[PDB]
Design a protein around this ligand. Structure first.
Ligand SMILES: Cc1cn([C@H]2CC[C@@H](COP(=O)(O)OP(=O)(O)OP(=O)(O)O)O2)c(=O)[nH]c1=O
Ligand SMILES: [Mg+2]
Ligand SMILES: [Zn+2]
Length: 1263
DNA sequence: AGTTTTGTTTTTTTTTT
DNA sequence: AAACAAAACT
RNA sequence: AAAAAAAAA
DNA sequence: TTTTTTTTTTTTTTTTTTTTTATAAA
DNA sequence: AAAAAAAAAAAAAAAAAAA
DNA sequence: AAAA
């Protein structure tokens, strides 16, 4: 059945009235709602929005008069066919269908005068549209029969004519037909003390048999009662979820602890398996939470329900006769009830504003949502069927979507004998006994809590509905039972039934047509208890992953970087360009639906081949026993199906298991000598991988390429892995177009002429184009992106954070992937383009020089791309000093003269020859940048405490390599580990024992070098912070942030200081501690950027003045804009102008009321600089709030010829108190809050009038 | 004795697959 | 980017 | 609207 | 081959030129 | 009054010619 | 107003 509701609302222009209505509609939950007298103009129709009723149709005039609206619930599929709106807003007709049945709804608001004739005229005008499926409802402003009035007076001739017209149209009064003897009313007329039914529901006589129920509903929103109709229609979808807001309730939390304990204590016994007991526990737990929520919600409304009952008790008696006592009290309570509803409504708005007030102009959800588009809902309206026809039947689309995904996963392979044959043909790694014992070790309680504490928050729960925040809240009681569960699984390899379930959601892939089923990616949601177990297993294998995976693969591997593959490939391209004979090819390959096509039986066989067996293997085997999924579409859950192939795309264990399977193919390609790779001096390069993304470098492609396709064809058979040969691009290099044509004819790949997009960057066929392709468009994009945002409503403080959030990440990624020597025009255009946006295309109010440092401007800091560029180019040196075999990208540059030089450059002796690196793209530029910084710092890098033993210094002496290794093993790796001067080898007994273990003749040579005074002096010096970055840190984590923080201090520049100018406008000198006090206050005055920005703007002299305008305009008119006649200096504007003086005098009266004693000194409120007596005082937090509120008040009317009033200051000061209140109780800082505002609140409430307090809604929140 | 520095810990967003 | 806590320099 | 690794603030 | 001179690039310093129309709230 | 831009000076490294 |  559907429900239709009609109500005259008597206006909706106030926001609160709209919220009350939304609450009332939500509680009624009508399928369709017809509202009259919205009083919204055609310009204000956007104001009417109600959650759950998105489809709304309105007719409105140009005045706040009349206005009607029809709202349809989101749960009702009403496809409209016709909408007719009255130009004056007295009626609206909408025609359409609900679940194939046609329906016509006419919402009418007749005028107070001539209502029966008006309605009759509308009926005639719409006669061609009012079919036998018509319902007419609204406020007719007239009775239809004698029973519609308490007077029982007969209806007039106009009403008689109207009734005749209704009869002519085959329309009847449904309410009167269903309740012929009803003496109920919808409107009360106080002038005559009478009651009448002037709101009506009329409809086609043909619909009478479908009318199940109709009733009148009293309300507090309007002076008219609503009417509801239930209509029979043929139907021809909810699952529980936890609400994290329910966990914060003290009472609720206290009770769940007891029941959780009680369940296990009662149930635990030998009659049931622990895997089953777990599912039973979750069932009971879900049942309890639903009961608690229902009770809580009802309990909350107990008072308002009592008042409603107490009214209702009397509200009906008034129909029989009117009694003064009832009449009077009814009127009193009916208004009082509206107060409670209003007060609780306001609270929910202030609680929202308080949350937003903390996150404004900061890098958090709100600011991100501002630049991003508004989220498009996840729903499928239509889809292209196999017949090629687009279709819209919900049942048909569900059938098509489910059939497609059910089919995909179903085909499991059965040719196990072939899988064994393939896995034997090649040499694969294996774990040793110690490593295998490391995996199969038992599970411990500490291992579990370590995971629970790390789970991500605010993530959608799995099908069972529990969230990560639940486990984190009850980890104290859950961990013991969770440990018992996993300990049971270890022994048996049998999981709880619920662990196999998962919910699928469909994601439309970027840049693809939504009309085709093939374009969407499924994302899987899994239960949190299941993900905890999978996380345990993944962390274990990750310890040993670097033994199984070769360095060629960098996707998902800890400590690797994606730019390794980029640089390595660019170097390879350069080599081919330089080559004199060209017979080479580069190929880019992508696996179609990589994670879904992996055959599970082959994946399990692979693990045994690598030596993984035992309990760890049994648990993995159990996981793939019988996984299933349920697709969720258009909000409703479809029938499950089995997942017989692939890996679960929303699982923490899937990324590693995929890599392990793919390595079987990589090892085969490298071990296959028929596929010729490329030779770079001592390096052979074949392949590079990032997850499923693969790139191959080949030589002699006519033979070499076909052998690759044969191998992959054989691998596809056993593993199910597949590639799209046509969507795979290649670069082909040949001496002649004849040869080129021949290769093109035989191969299936797409030959790219100019460039191939790869891992985020454009790879060019020739390295000369790197800048033009990668950096030139990046500028164009940023120039367009900031232009779109030019009118975004946020201050310069917010705009700065938008650049750091949106633009900075993509710039760094580019510098890091391709550090080529950029022309200075690039940085000029980049800075100009960015500042233009921050200052809203007007000349800057604060010089970029001042914003350069965190010490200044209260923590705001403008980004600096030139130093980020240097910090990235100079980062390569860390990989030179740390000498590692996993870094092959660092060895592929041309080495025509010598390949070894990069090991020797850092903290080692210089070379005479300068011809090396003549064609180096990356490294020659890095060296030049490294030296510039060292000479700027006035260092000798050539011989330092961090100089290695394996260095040219030692190798210039003629020493055996055996000697070098002997030293490094026993003593350490640096020359300082040996010792110099007087401590040559006597540094430790171990060294003195070692001294005889080396060749006498080499020892003689070492003594000479290590004892020289120069060697002693250079090695003994203390290491600088810059030197420690490269030598000390054995991890490259966070490296750019460190280098950048050093460059920021080395290149520090002198600037003007605005605080000195204040010291010149006033006749005083500020000490260094005072200038420091101001800087501190500007930072710590408040936790919200909304309040800090005001203080910063004041100190930094942000505002314009008549003096400045006179100079800029080349005029002599430097007189105060407020007409006081004096010269408009900046100190005059804030402190001295006679218009402003009364407000500051008022503030000092409040300070005296607080019993404080503070001099009348402008530096105190404007700058926060107190004299030495008060530097110890505690009331600074109270004063800070009073003063900042005064600065807002004065600034709001900067150039207005009028005095700032005290009442305006009180409003602003009270606004802050309201925002801080909810934050304090939310963060549980309520003790601090009371200490700050208690005294001030008492004073404020002591000076306002009861009328003023009421008018502005001022009342204590502490009391 | 007083303030400034140095490191870890918790919280945001963006890059690739 | 923030906050807290330990150590060193003024 | 889920997973992994990396980067910055 | 080695050392000094000359040429060029980059970074720092100083002077000269131009500006915006009020602000906070949104 | 204040911020940015343009001009000139200073220093260091590379390249060519002298010793 | 710039979330859920
Ligand atoms: C972008 C993205 C990717 N993944 C994983 C899972 C698959 C692999 C490969 O992704 P790919 O683009 O090749 O897609 P693929 O499945 O290979 O399908 P096509 O290559 O587009 O045919 O990455 C993920 O888990 N979440 C994501 O948001
Ligand atoms: Mg793929
Ligand atoms: Zn004045």
């Amino acid at each position: 059945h559907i429900t239709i509701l009609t109500l005259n609302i008597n206006g909706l222009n106030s926001a609160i009235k709209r919220h009350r209505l939304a609450s009332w509609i939500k509680s009624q939950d009508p399928s369709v709602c017809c509202i009259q007298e919205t009083h919204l103009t055609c310009r204000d129709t956007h104001r009417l929005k109600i959650k759950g009723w998105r489809k709304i149709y309105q007719a409105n005039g140009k005045q706040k008069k009349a206005g009607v609206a029809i709202l349809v619930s989101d749960k009702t599929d009403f496809k409209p066919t016709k909408i007719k709106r009255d130009k004056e807003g007295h009626y609206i007709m909408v025609k359409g269908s609900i679940q194939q049945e046609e329906l016509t709804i006419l919402n009418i608001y007749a005028p107070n005068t001539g209502a029966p004739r008006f309605i009759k005229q509308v009926l005639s005008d719409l006669q061609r549209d009012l079919d036998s499926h018509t319902l007419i409802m609204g406020d007719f402003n007239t009775p239809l029969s004698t029973l519609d009035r308490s007077t029982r007076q007969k209806v007039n001739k106009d009403t008689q004519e109207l009734n005749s017209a209704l009869h002519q149209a085959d329309l009847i009064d449904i309410y009167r037909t269903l309740h012929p003897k009803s003496t109920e009313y919808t409107f009360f007329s106080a002038p005559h003390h009478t009651y009448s039914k002037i709101d009506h529901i009329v409809g086609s006589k043909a619909l009478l048999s479908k009318c199940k129920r109709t009733e009148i509903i009293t309300n507090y929103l309007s002076d008219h009662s609503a009417i509801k109709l239930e209509l029979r229609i043929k139907n021809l979808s909810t699952t529980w979820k936890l609400n994290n807001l329910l966990l914060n309730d003290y009472w609720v939390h206290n009770e769940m602890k007891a029941e959780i304990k009680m369940f296990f204590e009662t149930n635990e016994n030998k009659d049931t398996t622990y895997q089953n007991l777990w599912d039973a526990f979750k069932a009971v737990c879900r049942g309890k939470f639903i009961a608690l929520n229902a009770y809580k919600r009802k309990q909350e409304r107990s008072k308002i329900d009592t008042l409603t009952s107490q009214l209702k008790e009397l509200e009906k008696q008034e129909q029989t006769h009117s009694k003064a006592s009832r009449r009077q009290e009814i009127t009193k309570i009916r208004a009082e009830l509206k107060e409670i509803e209003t007060q609780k409504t306001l609270q929910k708005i202030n609680e929202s504003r308080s949350w937003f007030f903390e996150r404004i102009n900061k890098i958090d959800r709100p600011l991100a949502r501002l630049i991003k588009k508004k989220r498009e809902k996840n729903q499928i309206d239509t889809i292209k069927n196999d017949k090629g026809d687009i279709t819209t039947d919900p049942t048909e689309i569900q059938t098509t979507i489910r059939e497609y995904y059910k089919h995909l996963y179903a085909n499991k392979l059965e040719n196990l004998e072939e899988m064994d044959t393939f896995l034997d043909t090649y040499t694969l790694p294996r774990l040793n006994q110690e490593e295998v014992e490391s995996l199969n070790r038992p599970i411990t309680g500490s291992e579990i809590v370590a995971i629970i504490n790390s789970l991500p928050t605010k993530k959608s729960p799995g099908p069972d509905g529990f969230t990560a925040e639940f486990y984190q809240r009850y980890k104290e009681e859950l961990v013991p039972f969770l440990l018992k569960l996993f300990q049971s699984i270890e022994k048996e390899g049998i999981l709880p039934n619920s662990f196999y379930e998962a919910s699928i959601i469909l994601i439309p892939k970027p840049g693809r047509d939504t009309t085709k089923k093939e374009n969407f990616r499924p994302i899987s949601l899994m239960n949190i208890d299941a993900k905890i177990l999978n996380k345990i297993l993944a962390n274990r294998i990750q310890q040993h992953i670097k033994k199984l995976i070769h360095h060629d693969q960098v996707g998902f591997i800890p400590g690797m970087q994606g730019w390794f593959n980029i640089r390595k490939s660019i170097n390879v391209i350069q080599h081919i360009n330089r080559a004199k004979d060209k017979n080479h090819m580069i190929i880019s390959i992508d696996a179609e639906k990589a994670f879904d096509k992996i055959q599970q039986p082959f994946m399990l066989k692979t693990l045994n081949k690598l030596g993984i067996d035992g309990t760890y293997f049994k648990i993995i085997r159990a996981i793939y026993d019988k996984p299933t999924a349920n697709i969720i579409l258009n909000g409703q859950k479809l029938e499950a199906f089995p997942l017989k192939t692939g890996t679960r795309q929303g699982c923490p264990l899937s990324p590693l298991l995929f890599n392990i399977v793919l390595e079987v193919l990589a090892r085969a390609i490298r071990q296959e000598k028929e596929i010729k790779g490329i030779q770079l001096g001592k390096e052979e390069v074949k392949l590079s991988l990032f997850a499923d993304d693969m790139i191959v470098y080949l030589e002699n492609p006519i033979v070499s390429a076909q052998n690759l396709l044969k191998l992959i064809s054989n691998f596809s058979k056993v593993s199910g892995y597949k590639i799209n040969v046509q969507k795979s691009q290649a670069f082909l290099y040949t001496n002649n177009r004849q040869t080129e044509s021949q290769i093109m004819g035989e191969l299936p790949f797409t030959i790219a002429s100019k460039r191939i997009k790869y891992l985020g960057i454009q790879l060019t066929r020739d390295v000369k184009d790197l800048f033009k392709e990668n950096y030139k468009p990046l500028l164009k994009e940023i120039k367009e992106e900031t232009n779109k945002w030019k009118n975004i409503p946020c201050s310069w403080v917010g705009r700065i954070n938008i650049v750091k959030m949106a633009i900075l990440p993509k710039v760094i990624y580019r510098f890091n992937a391709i550090p080529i020597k950029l022309p200075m025009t690039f940085f000029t255009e980049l800075e100009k383009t960015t500042l233009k946006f921050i200052w809203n295309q007007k000349r800057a109010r604060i010089a970029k020089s001042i914003l350069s440092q965190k010490n200044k401007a209260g923590g705001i800091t403008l980004p600096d791309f030139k130093l980020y560029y240097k910090a990235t180019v100079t980062k390569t040196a860390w990989y030179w000093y740390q000498n590692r075999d996993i870094d092959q990208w660092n060895r592929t540059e041309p080495s025509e003269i010598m390949p070894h030089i990069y090991n020797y450059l850092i903290f080692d002796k210089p070379e005479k020859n300068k011809q090396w690196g003549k064609d180096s793209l990356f490294n020659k530029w890095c060296w030049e940048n490294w030296l510039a910084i060292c000479r700027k710092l006035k260092l000798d890098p050539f011989l330092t405490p961090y100089t290695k033993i394996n260095s040219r210094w030692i190798k210039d002496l003629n020493v055996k390599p055996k000697t070098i290794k002997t030293l490094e093993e026993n003593l350490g790796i640096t020359i300082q580990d040996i010792g110099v001067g007087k401590d040559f080898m006597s540094k430790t007994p171990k060294a003195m024992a070692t001294k005889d273990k080396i060749d006498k003749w080499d020892l003689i040579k070492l003594k000479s070098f290590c004892t020289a005074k120069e060697t002693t002096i250079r090695v003994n010096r203390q290491p600088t912070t810059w030197e420690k970055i490269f030598a000390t840190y054995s991890s490259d984590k966070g490296l750019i942030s460190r280098i950048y923080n050093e460059l920021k201090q080395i290149y520090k520049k002198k600037t003007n200081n605005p605080i000195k100018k204040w010291a010149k406008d006033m006749n005083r000198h500020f000490s260094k501690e005072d200038i420091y006090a101001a800087k501190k206050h500007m930072k710590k005055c408040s936790s919200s950027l909304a309040i800090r920005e005001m203080q910063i703007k004041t100190t930094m002299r942000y505002h314009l003045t008549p003096v400045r305008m006179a100079i800029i305009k080349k005029s002599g008119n430097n007189r105060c804009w407020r007409g006081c006649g004096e010269i408009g200096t900046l100190l005059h504007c804030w402190w001295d102008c006679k218009l402003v003086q009364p407000l500051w005098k008022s503030v000092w009266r409040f300070l005296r009321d607080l019993e404080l004693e503070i001099p009348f000194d402008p530096a105190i409120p404007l700058l926060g600089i107190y004299p030495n007596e008060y530097k110890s005082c505690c009331y600074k937090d109270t004063c800070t709030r009073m003063f900042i509120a005064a600065l807002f008040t004065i600034a709001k009317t900067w150039n207005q010829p009028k005095c700032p009033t005290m009442i305006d200051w009180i409003k602003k000061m009270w606004h802050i108190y309201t925002m801080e209140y909810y934050a304090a109780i939310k963060n549980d800082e309520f003790i601090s809050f009371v200490g700050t505002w208690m005294k001030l609140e008492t004073i404020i409430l002591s000076k306002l009038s009861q009328e003023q307090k009421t008018k502005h809604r001022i009342f204590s929140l502490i009391g």
